Design a protein around this ligand. Structure first.
Ligand SMILES: CCCCCCCCCCCCCCCCCC(=O)OC[C@H](COP(=O)([O-])OCC(O)COP(=O)([O-])OC[C@@H](COC(=O)CCCCCCCCCCCCCCCCC)OC(=O)CCCCCCCCCCCCCCCCC)OC(=O)CCCCCCCCCCCCCCCCC
Ligand SMILES: Cc1cc2nc3c(=O)[nH]c(=O)nc-3n(C[C@H](O)[C@H](O)[C@H](O)COP(=O)(O)O)c2cc1C
Ligand code: SF4
Lengths: 56, 430
């Protein structure tokens, strides 16, 4: 992403593809390495009634 | 007949219910006890059992089982073991004082009934297991028994009928579970008050491993009057299959809480408005009624308008007639708190032998305390219903059923009250 415009035009002409739109090196678009804590949902059997195991 | 109630004083059995006459032998003989009891005993076992059967008397204990069939379960030839009549005089159940009243006021009726039932079933003795807290009642019972022994009504010549019968009085030591049949048998035998499983039934293996029959004080006390006046009269009182008179203990939010004797199938509204002086604040101020002691569920005012006081009528009303203990709660009653206090009673009075009643009744007590505080969510209502259904029918004795039924009644009728308490708690905390 630090390539000069001359080298970018040279690479794009040599490959035939617009390489700068789809770079194979990740710079900033990736997720942050620290994330907010999750709160995972519970399954369908997490209920206090009508949940006898013989019926499922 | 179609309408029942308005029992006449000449037809009331317990003529000294209020202690206004002499409770001793002279007053009892003036009131008509111990009359032709020798002739009854010479008529013998089969005639007495037929009289009970044609009277159609059902168990005043709260079980509701027929008395004639239950007593004819012991109409068998002896296999060398002695046979025993055992009289449930514990009266542990809340709301109920009728056995106390008739023990301290008509004890000679109880003694004569012990003799009649023991002769009918074939028995050398009747052990009256009285409640441990009823010390004065037990002492009055012993005074009456000493009078009967001195008069020759009891002991080695039962009123001169060449029949030997002894009446013992054994005091409990404070356990509601000892009012149960088999637990009472164990308590007499000297162990803890833990009910034993059936089979064997007590008519086969009971107290001291002998054939025995446990019967309520009211049942035993109305036995000799039934024999004297015939079973057709007692069957003529009450509805079909719910026959005779009954001692009702009306307590709670009524103007005159009292013990009265009234015919079976009396309307509940009629009984309250006639003998209890009505609900405090009026029939519109009535909220709920527990009609058969704590073991029966509650019924709201809407079905209390027209319900009768029968076993079958209360079964149709999704209740039971237990000890005929009518506990009345008005609009100011914290109904959830009252039911939780009942569940706390059952938690303190469980004998702890068997797992569903032990663990589940403690669990239901904790859940009901949180319901009173509002500290739950409405899914726990259905959870508590399922816990009650797991307790009911899975226990050794019927204390589990008698603890599951009030919870079921509260959930069945006053569910929006529980949801409103939970919502108010939730909005006042969050
Ligand atoms: C002929 C071309 C020579 C190379 C050149 O000029 O490259 C610059 C530049 C490279 O473009 P780029 O590929 O975008 O640069 C990579 C990053 O953008 C920018 O790279 P960067 O930002 O990561 O760091 C770049 C920095 C890095 O600096 C160094 O590496 C300094 C090293 C010092 C060692 C002591 O400076 C340079 O590379 C300056 C040019 C050095 C050329 C050295 C040539 C002689 C080598 C030794 C011979 C003996 O050239 C051009 O843009 C045009 C090239 C044709 C010019 C005619
Ligand atoms: C937990 C429990 C407690 C009971 N407490 C009493 C009691 O205090 N007095 C009583 O007469 N019956 C009590 N009973 C009911 C007895 O089963 C009943 O009295 C006994 O079977 C006598 O039968 P009857 O109703 O035909 O006279 C209790 C039952 C249970 C399950
Ligand atoms: S139900 Fe309760 S009181 Fe009855 S035997 Fe079981 S533990 Fe004892």
């Amino acid at each position: 992403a630090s390539a000069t415009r001359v080298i970018q035009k040279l690479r794009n002409w040599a490959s035939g593809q617009d390489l700068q739109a789809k770079l194979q090196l990740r710079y900033q678009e990736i997720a942050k390495r620290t994330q907010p804590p999750p709160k995972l949902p519970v399954g369908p059997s997490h209920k206090l009634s009508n949940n006898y195991y013989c019926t499922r | 007949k179609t309408s029942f109630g308005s029992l006449k004083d000449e037809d009331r059995i317990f003529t000294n219910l209020y202690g206004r006459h002499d409770w001793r032998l002279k007053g009892a003989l003036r009131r008509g006890d111990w009359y032709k009891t020798k002739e009854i005993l010479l008529k013998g076992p089969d005639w007495i059992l037929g009289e009970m059967k044609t009277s159609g008397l059902r168990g005043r204990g709260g079980a509701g089982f027929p008395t004639g069939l239950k007593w004819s379960f012991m109409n068998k030839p002896s296999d060398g073991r002695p046979k025993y009549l055992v009289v449930n005089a514990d009266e542990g159940e809340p709301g109920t004082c009728k056995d106390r009243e008739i023990m301290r006021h008509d004890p000679h009726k109880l003694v004569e009934g012990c003799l009649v039932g023991g002769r009918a079933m074939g028995a050398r003795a009747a052990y009256i297991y009285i409640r441990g807290e009823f010390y004065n009642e037990a002492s009055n019972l012993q005074v009456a028994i000493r009078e009967a022994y001195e008069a020759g009504l009891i002991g080695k010549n039962a009123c001169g009928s060449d029949y030997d019968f002894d009446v013992f009085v054994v005091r409990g030591a404070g356990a509601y579970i000892c009012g149960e049949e088999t637990a009472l048998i164990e308590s007499i035998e000297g162990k803890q008050g833990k009910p034993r499983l059936k089979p064997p039934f007590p008519a086969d293996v009971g107290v001291f491993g002998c054939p025995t029959t446990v019967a309520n004080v009211e049942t035993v006390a109305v036995s000799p009057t039934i024999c004297r006046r015939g079973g057709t009269w007692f069957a003529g009182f009450g509805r079909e299959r719910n026959s005779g008179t009954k001692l009702f203990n009306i307590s709670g939010h009524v103007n005159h809480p009292c013990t009265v004797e009234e015919e079976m199938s009396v309307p509940l509204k009629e009984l309250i408005e006639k003998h209890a002086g009505g609900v405090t604040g009026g029939w519109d101020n009535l909220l709920a009624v527990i009609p058969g002691g704590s073991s029966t569920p509650l019924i709201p005012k809407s079905v209390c308008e027209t319900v009768l006081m029968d076993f079958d009528a209360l079964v149709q009303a999704q209740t039971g007639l237990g000890t005929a203990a009518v506990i009345v709660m008005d609009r100011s009653t914290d109904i959830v708190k009252a039911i939780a206090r009942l569940i706390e009673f059952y938690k303190h009075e469980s004998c702890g032998q068997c797992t569903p009643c032990r663990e589940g009744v403690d669990w239901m007590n904790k859940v009901m305390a949180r319901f009173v505080k509002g500290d739950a969510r409405p899914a726990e209502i259905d959870s508590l219903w399922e816990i009650s259904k797991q307790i009911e029918g899975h226990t050794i004795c019927a204390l589990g059923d008698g603890a599951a039924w009030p919870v079921q009644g509260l959930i069945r009728h006053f569910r929006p009250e529980l949801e409103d308490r939970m919502q108010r708690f939730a909005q006042q905390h969050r």
